[PDB]
From Swiss-Prot:
Coiled coil: none annotated. Residues 9-113 form the Bromo domain. Component of some HBO1 complex composed of KAT7/HBO1, MEAF6, ING4 and BRD1/BRPF2. Component of the MOZ/MORF complex composed at least of ING5, KAT6A, KAT6B, MEAF6 and one of BRPF1, BRD1/BRPF2 and BRPF3. Interacts (via PHD-type zinc finger domain) with unmodified histone H3. Interacts (via PWWP domain) with dimethylated and trimethylated 'Lys-79' on histone H3. There is a cross-link at residue 41 (Glycyl lysine isopeptide (Lys-Gly) (interchain with G-Cter in SUMO2)). The lineage of its organism: Eukaryota, Metazoa, Chordata, Craniata, Vertebrata. It comes from Homo sapiens (Human). Highly expressed in testis. This is Bromodomain-containing protein 1. It is found in: Nucleus; Chromosome.
């Protein structure tokens, strides 16, 4: 139908905007701490601690399959990256501190993304 096509064009355009959001958030992680999944070879107990692992590569795979239907879903995954790290790692670690800085800096980007998503519809 023509309606399914229109809906599909909306999703495509959301995917465009989320790709730009993702790039902007990932620039806020210049050490690449959150770029890839925590390795279960190197952290073999990880899934005993963290039940829903997340990272920027995993998000990018979901994004490119148009697997984010709305900004809320995308933000859920970003918050998992931060929140998983702040539980597994102690306060005095470069990992925890990287997550705090990513959260603080990403807030700005996500604030305007929400306005854009609502504005363009």
């Amino acid at each position: 139908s023509m309606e399914q096509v229109a809906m599909e064009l909306r999703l495509t355009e959301l995917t465009r905007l989320l790709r730009s959001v993702l790039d902007q958030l990932q620039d806020k992680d210049p050490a690449r701490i959150f770029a890839q999944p925590v390795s279960l070879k190197e952290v073999p107990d990880y899934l005993d601690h963290i039940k829903h692992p997340m990272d920027f590569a995993t998000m990018r795979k979901r994004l490119e399959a148009q697997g984010y239907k709305n900004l809320h879903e995308f933000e859920e995954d970003f918050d998992l990256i931060i929140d998983n790290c702040m539980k597994y790692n102690a306060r005095d670690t470069v990992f925890y501190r990287a997550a705090v800085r990513l959260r603080d800096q990403g807030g700005v980007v996500l604030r305007q993304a929400r306005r854009e998503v609502d504005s363009i519809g």
